[PDB]
Amino acid sequence: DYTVEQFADLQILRYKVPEFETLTLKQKELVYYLTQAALEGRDILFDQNGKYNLRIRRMLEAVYTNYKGDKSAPDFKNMEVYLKRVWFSNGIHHHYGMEKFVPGFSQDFLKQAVLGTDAQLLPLSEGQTAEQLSDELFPVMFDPAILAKRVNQADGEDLVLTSASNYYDGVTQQEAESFYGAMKDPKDETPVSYGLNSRLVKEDGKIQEKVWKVGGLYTQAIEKIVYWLKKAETVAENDAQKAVISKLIQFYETGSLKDFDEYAILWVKDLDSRIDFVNGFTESYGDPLGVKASWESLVNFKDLDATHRTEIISSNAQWFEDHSPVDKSFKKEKVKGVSAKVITAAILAGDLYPATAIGINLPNANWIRAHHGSKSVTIGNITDAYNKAAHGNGFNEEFVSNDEERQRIDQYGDLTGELHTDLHESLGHGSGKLLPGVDPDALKAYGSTIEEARADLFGLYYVADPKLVELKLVPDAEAYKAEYYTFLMNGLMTQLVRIEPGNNIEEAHMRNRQLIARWVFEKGAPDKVVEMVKKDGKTYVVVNDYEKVRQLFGELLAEIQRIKSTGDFEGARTLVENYAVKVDPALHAEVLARYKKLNLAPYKGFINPVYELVTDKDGNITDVTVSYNEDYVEQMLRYSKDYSPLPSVNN
Ligand SMILES: [Zn+2]
């Protein structure tokens, strides 16, 4: 059963760990130790998303598990949904829309609930009462004007002070850009990531950094991570993988950002190990300035059979770059060579739990990828969990135009959808090269939208190529039409189920899909390439010429590749704001009404399996078992009890 529970706008799913039982005992132990190092870092993300998140959580968790009143009352059920969303979003803000949750319960209820809870169980400071803890946390929860956005990206506002994230403390956005612009090296051909694993604070009167390391900030959790990484080091598969674990331990112990670059080099060079993992401060989407990286972790092992399709996409990387529809001046003379593979996720943690991604391209250091290479991974068991949970839910029966399209989607939608993700992560982000002297940050806050659009267009253009039929990546030349329809139907229409009524598209991913869909829709109107007809009051997206759709994909890819490589900022502003922002209220209200009858949640998340060490009668380890019988509430409460080593307050 891939469906666990559904609440609010969130749906909890499960995923299997296929072929885990076939691993050796030394591999199962290495997986176990890496998964343990992953789970210990859950508290690190909560504190990064807000200085009150660890206190608001442990307060609600103490009230939830010790509530004495009627547990079937609307006040308790609405508090239960609130706590579940804080668990899902690793904070009090929406994981996708960045807006703060609105409590569906009164303050008088929570006040009497806190006072009715044992004061010893609440996250009280030294010599603090439950009243003082309520007076400080209630305005954070109930006042809509306090910490309204976890990540702000509005013009004319101090993005550091208007963001509820806890990456800066007592520092203005002007003082942060000047702080790193100064330590910005000039003639440095291998620039370190500056301020990646630290909190920029103003202790006393100086502007300094509190590095996240052993003996420093977040040391209570990092000591646990290093402990399990040392255990994983003793059962490493080979010396290349062992050096990766050892160098990562040094990065945690010293906080040296130079060791992180050395770790990223060794991690890229470890291509032959079956078991791989990510554990550290990786992606910087949580920072409004984009400099600090949130903590995430992923433990996986190579999917041997599924990797052979992604190794054909990699061995033909020069073919896809040469036959690209972009201008010849933007094509790379020789591809950098990306090591692409399909992985089976063993566990999720940090910013990858419970809401995770299906494809990751690392490292982020631009110079490390050029001189040493990158690793592109596709998570097969998560994509499989998405499909089998959505199989037969009747979402396509409601929004697809005709039954003849549904039959093609049911046959090739999973394959071409999974194959499009392979092209996106392994070749979409890596392909193309900027013109000499063009600022890589010339698109400003439009780079994230244009980059994902450029990668989606690369996957869409080539998933239809007749070479993938020659390379036996698709069973026939009609398979791409399933992915083309679902992408257009989602961008033009069905993705609005994730939008609040009266709002526009704000998130970067949802923007590039609508940008690609509406651009092809407008430019294909004279030939009726894509239509949006209505039948009995229901609007359907109709595709009439799938070949012309591909040509329009190439034209938009050539124009987007030109905008990125030449740094045309105002050109990207025209594209993103004219196609990827406006939402039709009449269509949006129609889609929501049709969607509500399906009883589906637009956002998905996964709960991790449960790994157990099997010991003999004398203490030695004989097996490592994996279970899938735990539920959402049980797992979050267990992680809060056994994998929560950080204090409630970290300033
Ligand atoms: Zn991507």
Author numbering: 25 to 675
Per the authors:
DPP III (EC 3.4.14.4; earlier names: dipeptidyl arylamidase III, dipeptidyl aminopeptidase III) is a cytosolic zinc-metallopeptidase of the M49 family. This exopeptidase catalyses the hydrolysis of the penultimate peptide bond of its oligopeptide substrates with unsubstituted N-termini, thereby sequentially removing N-terminal dipeptides. Despite a low sequence identity (17–21%), the overall structure of BtDPP III is very similar to the previously reported crystal structures of human and yeast DPP III and consists of two domains separated by a wide cleft. The catalytic zinc ion is positioned in the lower part of the upper structural domain, coordinated by His448, His453, and Glu476.
